[PDB]
Each structure stands twice: as C-alpha cells, then as structure tokens.
Amino acid sequence: TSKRRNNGRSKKGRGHTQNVRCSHCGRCVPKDKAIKRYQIKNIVEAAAVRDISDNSALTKYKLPKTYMKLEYCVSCGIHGRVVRVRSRTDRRNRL
Amino acid sequence: EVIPGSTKDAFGVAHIYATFNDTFVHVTDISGKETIIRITGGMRVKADRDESSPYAAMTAAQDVAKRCKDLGVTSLHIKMRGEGGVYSKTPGPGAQAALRALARANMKIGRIEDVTPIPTDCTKRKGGRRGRR
Amino acid sequence: EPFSKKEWYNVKVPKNFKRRTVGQIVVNKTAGTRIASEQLKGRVVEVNLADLMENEKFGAYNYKFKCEDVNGKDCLMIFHGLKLTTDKLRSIVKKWCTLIETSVDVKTTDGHLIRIFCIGFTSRKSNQIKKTSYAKSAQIKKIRKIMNNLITKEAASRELTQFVDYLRENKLPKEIVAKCSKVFSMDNVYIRKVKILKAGKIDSLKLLDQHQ
RNA sequence: GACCUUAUAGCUCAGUGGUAGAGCACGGGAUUUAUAAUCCCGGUGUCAUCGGUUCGAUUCCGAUUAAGGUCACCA
RNA sequence: UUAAUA
RNA sequence: ACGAUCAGAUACCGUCGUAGUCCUAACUAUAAACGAUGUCAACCAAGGAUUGGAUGAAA
RNA sequence: GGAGUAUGGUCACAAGGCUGAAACUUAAAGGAAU
C-alpha cells in the first residue's frame, strides 16, 4: 500500500498548492511534489576561462555566474539521474 | 586602403543566441540599432541537424570576427542568451564554442552578461498537462 | 558594399561621469529626406557604470542614455535609466529569508517624474541559531512604509542629475538599513531599477549646462 | 434504342510503331525459439476475340463480344 | 528511431 | 486539418487550429472531493525542532 | 459478477445527479508479506 508516509509530497496543513512546470518534460506538477534543484555555474566553461582572461579589455573584471532553479517531475527526475531509486530502508533518509 | 565606413579601435556588442536547434552570432554597435555582421550556425552547414553543433558555432564566430576587424571593431561585449521565455533557460551547446572562438580570434572581450529573458510571470507553456512524451 | 554609406559618431555623456566618451554609434549617411542628425534622435545607449566612473566597484549597474542632439559628430546624451546587472540581481536572493520589494513614483525638483524600485532582505544575526529568518506581515508593512517614505525624501528634494550622482554614494542604502534595523535585521538593500515615466521639459541651455 | 468511353500478371492499375513498367500477391534463401514484420533473389502478362493499314500492331483503322456513363421529352 | 503475438 | 514513424497509426513526435481556457449573472453538484482514517470527550513512553501568544533572565 | 445496470420516483435547459433491484452465472475474487 502506502510506499511513503508523506505520500511523496511536502504538503501537510493545506489542501491545494499551485502547479509548476517540469523543466524538461513541461509537465504540470504541484509545487511541493516537484523535485527542486538549484544550479549556480559560471557563464564560461573551465576550458575557456583562460582564453577569455588572456585577451580582455577590462582591468580585473570578475566573471559572473548564472543562477537558476530547476524543477523536475518524478518521471524526468528519475530518468535524468537527478534522483535514484533507493533501498526500502534507505528511503527514510532525508539528509 | 581603408574599408569604407570603417574606423579605428572601437567597441561592439555580440548577441550570442544559441538554442538547441540553432545558434546566432550577431554583433551590433553600442546603441544596438545598427548591426555589423550577423552569421548563424545554419549558414555554415548542409544538414539541418548540425546547425547546433559546436563546430558550426566557431565557424560562424570566426567569420564574424574577421569581418569586424576589417571594419574597425576590435573589442566586444558578450550578451549570452538562450530560449528562456517559458522553456529551458540553459543556453545550447554552441553558445560556449562561439564565445571561445571569438576569444581565440584575438578579440578583446569586455563585460560578459546572461540576457536570457526570465519571465516575472509566464503564459501557458506548450505541451499540455502531461508534457512531452 | 553595405558599409559604404555608414558614418560613425562620437558619444558624449554628461559631465557627471569621469569618462566622457563611451564609444561610437553607426548611422547611414544623409539622403534626400533623411538627415543623420535627425535619425540619431531616439537612440538609446546602454553602458555599465564601471566604465563611466573608471572604477570596478561600480560594476553591478547598467546605465542607459538617449541622444538629444547631434552637435557636430557628437551625440550629447542625457540620462535615461539605470538597472541592476542580471547576475547581481539573482545573486542576492537568499532562500530562507524574506524578500521586501517596493516602488515609488517621485516628482523631482526640476520637473522629471521617475519611478524607483527598491529591494531588501531580512538577514540573519551574529548569534542566530535557527535556520529561518522570516518576518511577520506586520513587520514587512512597517519596513516597506519606512523605505517608501525615506526614499521619497531623498529623491524629491534634489534634481534628477544630482539625485543620480547621489545613488552612486551608498548613503541611501546605508541609511535604509540603519533605519529599518529597529524593526528587523536587514543586510542587502539595493535600488534595482530607476525609470523615467514622464520626461520633464529640457532646454538647450540647460542641456549645455549638463554638457560642459 | 441512340451517343461516349474502356478491356494489359492471380487483384488493382501505368505505359504504349523496333525490348510492357508499378505495386499487392506467389516461390526460394537469410534474421527469429516459432509466426508476423524486415533483408536478398526469382518467376509472372495471349496487352478482350477477328480482319486491314501494316517494313513491323499490344498501340493505327473497322468488326464481334463483355463493362460501364448520359438521353429516351410535349402530348 | 523502430521491437506485435504464442 | 496537415507532416512524420509504423505492417497499419484514426496515437505518442512536429505545425496550424474551432469550442474552451479569462470576467460578469445564472445553472450544474460531481473527483484518487484522500489522512482512502466520521464528530465530541478522558487517560497515555522518551525526545529535538518549528508557527502564534503569555510570562522570567539575558541589550 | 450481473451493476450503480433495468424499471419506478424526483431534481436539471442538457449532459447528468439522488434513490435503486431482479433473473441468471460462478469456487473463488481479493489484502499484506516471503
């Protein structure tokens, strides 16, 4: 029956939550049920950082980063290896 | 002698718009209303599946670089961008290749910025409730 | 040849900034009923603040200028707006804190009508142990009313040109933090965008005062 | 009854004065545990039945059959 | 990319 | 309604697109309307944390 | 299983909603775990 005590959600004291769109499928998933991951990366890959820094017109300009929050449905979180299927006794670990 | 309309060391801004289905290299002036040279990844390929290849990005980027030096533009501002309207905001693979190609063409780079348009709030996304399958 | 008809004009920003020339803008040469000085009348130039001041402690601000006349191959610019850099705006949004946003419509002393946007964030404390730092709905409204009133006093009393140069000094963000700290712990206060809703009347002599 | 048109592989069709092409179907071989699908190869047409022009007719011209389409009205 | 049945 | 895929595809993929999606007034009264756990009341093992108060200390 | 089906009653502009069987058929259907 109940594979999870919380039913796979994060909703406890309410009846409805708004929807969000899967970043890969475009599916509609509720805000709590969606798999939310955060990403902070530089706009230049590790190979090209040296090339840009060589020929630059600015004194010591610091390369900016990009920040975006990605939300995945369950199907596209498992398939994209964002999350894995865990053991029956290891499902309970929340760290 | 000098190419008509060209000047000395000046500044331009490159609008690198690279999706997963194509890539754009587009340089304008500081105002942005005048374009110098616009080359896309689809003009340097034959089949339709290679317009997003990183190889097509540098080939288009080098052609942009060569023209700009001949026209007096020597340094560029980078405005990196992807199709981030309501869809994935991650720029395509050719975005980094084009920027690295411009650097390796001995072009001074000024400020680098990400100008993917993030909606303050969005219209309905294509696909439906259950999305792509 | 496409560029055979093109001309390059020098761009001049007002005297408020350390750097007076920011670049060159392109326009086609004149034609029958097409004068370049007439065509370079609505061009908006966007330049970083780390270039007009020649210091990189101003790097997270983009400034925009419009052209008001062509004075012999020179485009005399006037201030058109300011906006936080996209990387900076998304780099100051922490997760477990309350975000406070506001906007004010202020009429300057010299007649310009502008819109100013302010952002803020409830902060942690030195000895704070609990992870979250949220504010009640009463404290948010108290903070917003303070930063709404405080930003209006500093902006309405001064003209547009001198108010913009005031924004370069951190007095306003520092004063907001030092006056909202008696209600809640605030750390990051920035003016993310300034618009110009209604362009006030200007004169050539006033513009000449603005340009040397 | 009078006008018009058609008849080609086992089935639907193309093309047609010097050698009839397409599929679908059929036979054999390969893949499969086996079938289906898939790949390879092959065999298929009295060009509806008689006369004449025909260099030479399956094509052009008449005839005999079948098959269809239209008309068959005023009283 | 496609993968039906006993 | 097109275009692909397929043996076929009236589907999954792509393009266009009517009702609908939005607001006002009136109907309809159904959901995996779920905590699949009726409402009220008493007793009830160890904790750590959190939301809103009251009350001491620590500014 | 038949079946929330038929009929009867009632509500609705309609789709439908509420109430709601029987004949007949069948040794299992089902729940949690190894």
CA dihedral C199, C201, C206, C212 (to 10 degrees): 20
Q: What is the C-alpha to C-alpha distance for residues C188 and C185, in angstroms, rounded to an integer? A: 10
Residues of chain B positioned with their CB less than 8 A from the CB of A52: 99-100, 103, 109, 112
Pairing of strands A35-42, B10-14: unpaired
CA of A21 to C1' of F2 (A): 29
Q: What is the C-alpha to C-alpha distance for residues C97 and A33, in angstroms, rounded to an integer? A: 22
Q: Is A57 on the interface with C (CB under 8 A)?
A: no
Q: What is the C-alpha to C-alpha distance for residues C161 and C194, in angstroms, rounded to an integer? A: 13
* Nearest of B85, B76, B96, B88 to residue B124 by alpha carbon: B85
| Secondary structure of B42-72 in HEC code, one letter for each residue | HHHCCCCCCCCCHHHHHHHHHHHHHHHHHCC
CA distances from C38 to B73, C7, C44, C145 (A): 25, 14, 14, 45
Q: How far is CA A79 from the centre of its chain?
A: 13
Q: Which residue of C has its CA nearest to A41?
A: C87
Give C209's contacts (C-beta < 8 A, 6+ positions apart).
none
Query: Could you say which nucleotides of strand F lie within 7 A of any protein CB atom?
Result: 12-15, 35-37, 49-53
H helices present in C3-157, as ranges: 36-39, 49-52, 86-91, 137-156
Q: Which class for B98: exposed (0-12), middle (13-18), buried (19 or more C-beta within 10 A)?
A: buried
B126: which nucleotide lies closest, measuring CA to C1'?
A: F14
Q: What is the C-alpha to C-alpha distance for residues B127 and B22, in angstroms, rounded to an integer? A: 21
H helices present in chain A, as ranges: 49-54, 74-79
- Which residue ranges have CB below 7 A from strand F? A 1-2, 7, 11, 15; B 126-127, 131-133; C 129-130, 132, 134, 136
Q: How far is CA A40 from the centre of its chain?
A: 11
At C140, the amino acid letter reads I
CA distances from C83 to B85, C20, C116 (A): 20, 20, 10
At C65, the amino acid letter reads F
Q: What is the C-alpha to C-alpha distance for residues B105 and C113, in angstroms, rounded to an integer? A: 46
Q: Is the dihedral of CA C16, C20, C21, C27 positive or negative?
A: positive
Give B59's contacts (C-beta < 8 A, 6+ positions apart).
B41, B44
Q: How far is CA B2 from the centre of its chain?
A: 27
Q: What is the C-alpha to C-alpha distance for residues B24 and B34, in angstroms, rounded to an integer? A: 16
* Nearest of C23, C86, C80 to residue C59 by alpha carbon: C86
Q: Are C161 and C79 in contact (CB under 8 A)?
A: yes
Comparing CB atoms, the residue among A44, A48, A58 nearest residue B110 is: A58
Pairing of strands A35-42, B17-18: unpaired
Residue showing tokens 């990189």: C56
Element at C97 (helix H, strand E): none
Instruction: Identify the residue among C22, C24, C45 best suited for mutation to test binding to B, counting B beta carbons within 10 A and taking the highest.
Output: C24
Element at B31 (helix H, strand E): none
Cβ contact B126–A55 (<8 Å): no
CA distances from C17 to A43, C20, C155 (A): 29, 7, 19
**HSE-up of C210 (CA within 13 Å, CB side)?**
20
Q: Are A43 and A66 in contact (CB under 8 A)?
A: yes
Q: What is the C-alpha to C-alpha distance for residues C87 and C169, in angstroms, rounded to an integer? A: 21
CA distances from C178 to A9, C96, C143, C182, C192 (A): 41, 22, 12, 8, 19
Which contacts (CB < 8 Å, 24+ apart) does range B115-122 have? Answer: B115/B79, B115/B80, B115/B81, B115/C86, B116/B80, B116/B81, B116/B82, B116/B83, B116/B84, B116/B89, B116/B91, B117/B81, B117/B84, B117/B85, B118/A68, B118/B84, B118/B89, B119/B85, B119/B86, B122/B85, B122/B86
Residue A63: what are its φ and ψ, rounded to 5°?
-65, 130
Cβ contact B109–A57 (<8 Å): yes
**Secondary structure letter of residue C42 according to DSSP:** S
Structure tokens of B124?
């309905």
Name the region of A72 (left: φ>0; alpha: ψ -120 to 50; beta: rest): beta
Q: What is the C-alpha to C-alpha distance for residues C27 and B28, in angstroms, rounded to an integer? A: 12
